[PDB]
Amino acid sequence: SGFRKMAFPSGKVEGCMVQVTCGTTTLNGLWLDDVVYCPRHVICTSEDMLNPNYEDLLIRKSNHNFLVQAGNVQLRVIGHSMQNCVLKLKVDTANPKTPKYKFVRIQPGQTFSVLACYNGSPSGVYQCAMRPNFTIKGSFLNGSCGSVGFNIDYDCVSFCYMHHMELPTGVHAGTDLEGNFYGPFVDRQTAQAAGTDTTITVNVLAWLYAAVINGDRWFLNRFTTTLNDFNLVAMKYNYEPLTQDHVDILGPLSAQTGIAVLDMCASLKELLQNGMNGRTILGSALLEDEFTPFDVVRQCSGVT
Amino acid sequence: SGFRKMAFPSGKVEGCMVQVTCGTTTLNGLWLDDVVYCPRHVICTSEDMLNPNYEDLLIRKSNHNFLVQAGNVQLRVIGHSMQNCVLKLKVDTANPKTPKYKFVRIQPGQTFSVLACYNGSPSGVYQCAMRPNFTIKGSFLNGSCGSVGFNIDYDCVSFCYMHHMELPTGVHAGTDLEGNFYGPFVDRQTAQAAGTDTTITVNVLAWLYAAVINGDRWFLNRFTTTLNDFNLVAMKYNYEPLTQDHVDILGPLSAQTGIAVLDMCASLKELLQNGMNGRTILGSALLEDEFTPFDVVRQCSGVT
C-alpha cells in the first residue's frame, strides 16, 4: 500500500533525447527512427519572438544549420520541414534506441509523465495532468523546450506533449507531437489568456477511492447524492460536471471498494462544503485531481 | 518556473532490474557487474516469515535454486552469499547496462528516487524522503521487494535503498545495498515499532525558499526569530531542531532570495502557529518536507 504521484519509468524516453541548436538557440529534440522532432521556435532569436514569421525564418535555414547532437555523436541532417509548431529534421541514421511508440493527442483531465531535459540531457521526471484549460503546471526552466510528456502501455510509448512555452502566469503550454498546441496558445512572447480552469472531478473521486483502498477512510459518510445534486455543488466549487461516462470509468474502483459512485460523490460534496477540518487524505491537505481512475488502478494493481 | 516532486530519470536503474525466484517466492534483484543483489527473504516460504532462521534456510539452497531472469535471458548463478539482509548472487555475465555506481547509506531527512518494480519489470518512479525515524512512505505492493532507491550525480548512480517490507502501519522499511536495515527493523512478519517521527525542518525551509523563487510569497512577514526561539516552536510542533549546519546548507537559497535564514524561520514559525488559513504554497495545503536544499537548487538551476 501507499500512494504516490508516480511517473512512468523514463528509460525509453531518455534514449530518444537529443540537443538541437540553430544559430544561438539550443533546445531539446526527440529522435524517433530517422526523424528529430523539436519546437519550431529553435529557429528564432530574441528579436523574433514578439511575432515570428516562422515561414520566413525557416526559409533562411538549411539542413546544415540544424546541429543535432545525441550525447557524443553528431547527427547528419538531410531534410527539414515545419508541421504546425514543430520542426521535423530528417537525419541519416535511425535512432537505435527507438522504442515502440505512438503519437497521441490526449484529452484535458488526462495525465502523463514529463521528462524534463536541458541540452538534450534528462534532469528529472514527474507526473502531470493536462488541465481542463489545456495548460500544464509543470516545472520547466529556460532551455527545457522540447522536453516531452508521455504514457507507457507495457512496451509502447505514446508521446502526447512537447513543451514549448511558459506563459506570463507561470503555467506551461505546448503541443501534441504533430505540433498542434493544446489550448488557444500561439508560439510568441505575448500575454495569452488561459481559459477558466476547473478541478477534474472524476480524478478527485478516483483519488478518494485510492484513499479508501490505502486505509484513509475518515471522509466516508452515511450520505448519498444524485448526479444533479452533486453537479449543483460541483458548479459552486468550480469542479467539472460529473457525467455517466465518468461514473462508468469509476466502475472498477466502485466494485473493488464496494462504495457506490454516488455515495463517494456525497463524501466529495461534504468535503467541498466543509473542507478537511485540518485533516489529511493520502498525505494531502487538499483534494488531489492529478490521478485518473486508470492511474489509481495501475498503481494499486502493480502494472509494469 | 514551477515546482514538482521530481524524481531522477530512471533509465540507468531500469537497465539493472532483474527477477529473482527461489522456490515459490519471486522478487526483484539489482544486477550490477557480475553480481545480483536482492532481499534475503527470497529464500523463505510463508511458514518461515514469522521468525526465519536465514542461515539454515540458505544452507538448503544451491546456486541452481536461484533463478535470475533479465527480461528474456536467464543468468547463470555461480555463487551465493548472504551479507546482512541481502543476498549477493554471483552470475557468469557482467551486466552490459551497468552504469557508474556507488553504494551509499543515506542520512535520515535525505531524499531519493524509487523505481518500483514487479517481477524484474519497472512500473513507475517517485521521489521519497528517508523519514527521521528511518521508514519511508512509499507506494509498494506484494512483489515490490528488491525495488531500489537511488540518487544520480550526472553519470553516477548512488544506490541507497532496497525495499524489503511493509510494516503493519502501512509504512515501508528496507536496507542500504550492504543489507543493513535503516532503522530498528528486522526482516520478519512481526509488529515492529517505528520511532516517533518528526518533520524535516531544513527541508520545509528549503521548500519555502522554492516557493519564494517560484512566485508564492504570501507567507513572508515583517518578523525574524533566533535559533533558540525557533527551536521552542519546532519542539511544540514536532519538527527537527534547527542547527547552524542546517542554516549553513540553506546559504545558497538565502543568498539567491536575499531572505536571511532566521527571517525564513520566522515565516515558518507563523505558519506553524497559525496554519495556512485555507491558502496554498506551491500547490500544497501543508508544509512539505520532502525537498532538501540540494533538491531545490538542482530543480531551480536545471542540473542534468
Ligand SMILES: Cc1cncc(NC(=O)Cc2cccc(Cl)c2)c1
Ligand atoms: C522558464 C521557462 C519555462 N519553459 C519554457 C521557457 N521558454 C519559453 O517560454 C521561450 C518562449 C518564448 C515565447 C514563445 C515560445 Cl513558444 C517560447 C522558459
Ligand SMILES: Cc1cncc(NC(=O)Cc2cccc(Cl)c2)c1
Ligand atoms: C504490500 C507490500 C509492500 N511492500 C512489501 C511487501 N512485502 C512484505 O512485506 C513481505 C515481508 C514480510 C515480512 C518481512 C519481510 Cl522482510 C517481508 C508487501
